[PDB]
Amino acid sequence: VLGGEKEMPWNFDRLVKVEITDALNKKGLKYDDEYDVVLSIKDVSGKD
Amino acid sequence: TLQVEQALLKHGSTVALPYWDWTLPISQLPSLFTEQTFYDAWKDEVLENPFARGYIKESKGYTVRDPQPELFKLSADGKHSVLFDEVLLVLEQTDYCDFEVQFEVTHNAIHYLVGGHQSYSLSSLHYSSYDPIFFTHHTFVDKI
Amino acid sequence: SLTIGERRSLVLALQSLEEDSSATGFQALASFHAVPPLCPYPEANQRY
Amino acid sequence: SLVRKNVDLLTDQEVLSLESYLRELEDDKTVNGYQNLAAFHGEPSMCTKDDGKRVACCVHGMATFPQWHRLYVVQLEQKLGKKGLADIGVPYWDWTKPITALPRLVQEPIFKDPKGGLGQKNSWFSGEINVDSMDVHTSTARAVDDRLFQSVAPGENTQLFEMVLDALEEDDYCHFEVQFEVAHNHIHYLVGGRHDHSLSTLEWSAYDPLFFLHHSNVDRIFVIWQELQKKRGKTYDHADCSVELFRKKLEPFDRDTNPIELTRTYSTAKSLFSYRQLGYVYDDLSLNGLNIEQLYNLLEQRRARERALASFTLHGLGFSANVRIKVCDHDSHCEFAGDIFILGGANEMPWEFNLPYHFDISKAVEHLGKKLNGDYVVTAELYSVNGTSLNPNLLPRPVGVYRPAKGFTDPKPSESDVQSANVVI
Numbered sequence: 001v002l003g004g005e006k007e008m009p010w011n012f013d014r015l016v017k018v019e020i021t022d023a024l025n026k027k028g029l030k031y032d033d034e035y036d037v038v039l040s041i042k043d044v045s046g047k048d
Numbered sequence: 049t050l051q052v053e054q055a056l057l058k059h060g061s062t063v064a065l066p067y068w069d070w071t072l073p074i075s076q077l078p079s080l081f082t083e084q085t086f087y088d089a090w091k092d093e094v095l096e097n098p099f100a101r102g103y104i105k106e107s108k109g110y111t112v113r114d115p116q117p118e119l120f121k122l123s124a125d126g127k128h129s130v131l132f133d134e135v136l137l138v139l140e141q142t143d144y145c146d147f148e149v150q151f152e153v154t155h156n157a158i159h160y161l162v163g164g165h166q167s168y169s170l171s172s173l174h175y176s177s178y179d180p181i182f183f184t185h186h187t188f189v190d191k192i
Numbered sequence: 193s194l195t196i197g198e199r200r201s202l203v204l205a206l207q208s209l210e211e212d213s214s215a216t217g218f219q220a221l222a223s224f225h226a227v228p229p230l231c232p233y234p235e236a237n238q239r240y
Numbered sequence: 241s242l243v244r245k246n247v248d249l250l251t252d253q254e255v256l257s258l259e260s261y262l263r264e265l266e267d268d269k270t271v272n273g274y275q276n277l278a279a280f281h282g283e284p285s286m287c288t289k290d291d292g293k294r295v296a297c298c299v300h301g302m303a304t305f306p307q308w309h310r311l312y313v314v315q316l317e318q319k320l321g322k323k324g325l326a327d328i329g330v331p332y333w334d335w336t337k338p339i340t341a342l343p344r345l346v347q348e349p350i351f352k353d354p355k356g357g358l359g360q361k362n363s364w365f366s367g368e369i370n371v372d373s374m375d376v377h378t379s380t381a382r383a384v385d386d387r388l389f390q391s392v393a394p395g396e397n398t399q400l401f402e403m404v405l406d407a408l409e410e411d412d413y414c415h416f417e418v419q420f421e422v423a424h425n426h427i428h429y430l431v432g433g434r435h436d437h438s439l440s441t442l443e444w445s446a447y448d449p450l451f452f453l454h455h456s457n458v459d460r461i462f463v464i465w466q467e468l469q470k471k472r473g474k475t476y477d478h479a480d481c482s483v484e485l486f487r488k489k490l491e492p493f494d495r496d497t498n499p500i501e502l503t504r505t506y507s508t509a510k511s512l513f514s515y516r517q518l519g520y521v522y523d524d525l526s527l528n529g530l531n532i533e534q535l536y537n538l539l540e541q542r543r544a545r546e547r548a549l550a551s552f553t554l555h556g557l558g559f560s561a562n563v564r565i566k567v568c569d570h571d572s573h574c575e576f577a578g579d580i581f582i583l584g585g586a587n588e589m590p591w592e593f594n595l596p597y598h599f600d601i602s603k604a605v606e607h608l609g610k611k612l613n614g615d616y617v618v619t620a621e622l623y624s625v626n627g628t629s630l631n632p633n634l635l636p637r638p639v640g641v642y643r644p645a646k647g648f649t650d651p652k653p654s655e656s657d658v659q660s661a662n663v664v665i
């Protein structure tokens with residue numbers, strides 16, 4: 001996401017999609033199995 | 049009936065108890081009694097109208113009103129209740145004792161018309177003084 | 193320049209108002225000048 | 241199962257039976273207390289936050305709202321039945337018909353004895369919250385708003401009716417969630433009103449039995465939507481969205497502390513998509529005289545109608561609020577447009593929607609007189625529970641959308657022959 005200090009507030013309406021099928025099948029886990037999604041956000045400055 | 053006005057004034061009255069003229073056609077009970085609860089927000093608390101029920105300090109119950117079909121009957125012209133004719137009859141005669149004997153049952157009537165078939169209502173005089181419509185009606189009686 | 197009759201009338205009328213607690217009560221009427229604020233109108237988020 | 245009726249068609253003896261059972265359930269608490277059952281829904285809730293923040297257990301804004309509340313109502317009806325009553329379940333109050341006043345069961349403040357004698361409390365009029373930790377030992381209230389009885393001219397009907405009609409019209413569960421929560425969130429505010437302890441809030445909203453009188457009809461229209469979608473032929477028994485949320489187990493009915501065993505049997509969210517096994521059947525599946533075929537045809541014909549709509553995005557507030565929506569001409573001739581209600585509470589999970597909300601604005605634009613596909617602007621005003629307004633920049637600005645008639649096509653782009661010489665490639 002491209003953000004700066006002088007950004008007028010903005011918020012989306014509907015979720016954005018990312019494909020996961022090609023990794024879930026490659027691990028063998030069906031979508032209903034117990035699995036987690038972990039995301040780590042790093043700014044350009046370098047702070048998590 | 050007069051006795052209650054001194055208590056009301058000393059406790060913060062504004063006008064005396066109004067009289068209800070039931071000789072006029074009666075669509076239903078007056079909306080002042082018919083209303084249940086109103087909100088004013090001055091105390092930020094809804095207030096229930098004390099002109100529907102009455103608490104009893106010995107029985108822990110409350111009175112219950114009941115309309116009766118005959119109360120809604122109307123005269124030939126439609127501008128008077130059926131009780132109008134007998135009210136005129138009471139008015140017309142001369143002697144005071146005859147007036148009283150002809151007059152008692154007249155105001156006794158509404159007690160039974162609105163008291164229904166409940167032991168705790170205006171039907172029995174034992175507890176009829178626990179409903180303010182009784183005060184209003186006897187005020188109209190004094191007016192007669 | 194008052195006399196007994198009307199002086200009694202005024203004092204009794206005011207003492208009648210004082211212990212009232214109605215919509216046209218002494219407290220309610222005198223509340224217009226000051227706290228609680230009800231003006232310009234309670235709908236506005238600023239009250240004074 | 242238990243057959244279910246609407247309140248306006250019941251007779252006296254069953255009313256007396258159900259009121260007797262309700263009184264004998266609400267007087268005693270033990271663990272089978274009506275106050276505890278309400279606290280299951282609201283404050284004081286028991287499902288603490290996963291961060292230990294002591295948050296409510298009430299599901300609002302998520303996928304499992306209708307299922308959780310249907311489980312709640314069936315739990316209470318089974319609770320009542322276990323006390324010895326085996327005739328009728330908790331009846332449903334219909335408001336789709338143009339309403340004028342409250343139903344008879346919730347009218348009298350203190351019930352009369354049918355034979356005549358000592359009176360008895362009317363629970364259906366009101367209940368009482370007697371929490372000692374929060375030192376609130378006071379009865380609830382019904383701060384009714386007068387604007388719930390809009391008897392309008394025929395042809396068109398109450399805005400509640402049209403809006404819930406569009407809600408049941410829409411043809412996807414994930415969108416049905418959003419299009420349903422707004423409809424559910426109307427009566428709560430409009431009955432709770434100014435008083436804090438009422439239906440408008442969320443801490444003690446369910447103490448008044450109007451909660452169940454409402455959620456019964458909620459489940460009814462949910463079932464009619466399921467049957468309509470089944471007839472139109474799309475998959476409904478499984479949801480292609482919020483699968484993780486469905487996999488999540490409901491709380492706190494899972495734990496063994498619940499005396500009712502049916503909740504322990506059906507703690508999973510998946511099984512609730514079928515209502516027959518729960519044990520109650522609605523007598524009629526017609527909406528104010530219109531049955532499956534008529535409503536199907538009406539919805540199909542209405543899905544080819546030009547419309548102007550307002551799109552919204554929303555989240556939690558922490559306190560319920562009205563939003564009056566306003567349509568103006570561009571820069572002034574600006575006229576009233578409509579209303580929206582949102583529910584908030586002190587203890588409630590931060591909820592956000594997965595889809596923008598659609599609202600009808602076509603009639604207001606027509607009143608303004610501009611063409612539906614013309615131009616205009618939309619603004620919003622926010623009011624709190626206590627009537628007063630608030631800084632209207634908290635919510636994101638509304639947007640306008642034009643929905644064309646089905647079969648419409650865009651104007652054809654130009655083809656050109658040599659593009660003259662002004663063009664640059």
Ligand SMILES: *[C@@H]1O[C@H](CO)[C@@H](O[C@@H]2O[C@H](CO)[C@@H](O)[C@H](O)[C@H]2NC(C)=O)[C@H](O)[C@H]1NC(C)=O
Binds near residue numbers: 624
């Ligand atoms: C209605 O209730 C809200 C509850 O928040 C009140 O908002 C608070 O008002 C006080 C001053 O009156 C402020 O100090 C708080 O910051 C406000 N709270 C929030 C969350 O903004 C509001 O004042 C009440 N209005 C009326 C007319 O009673």
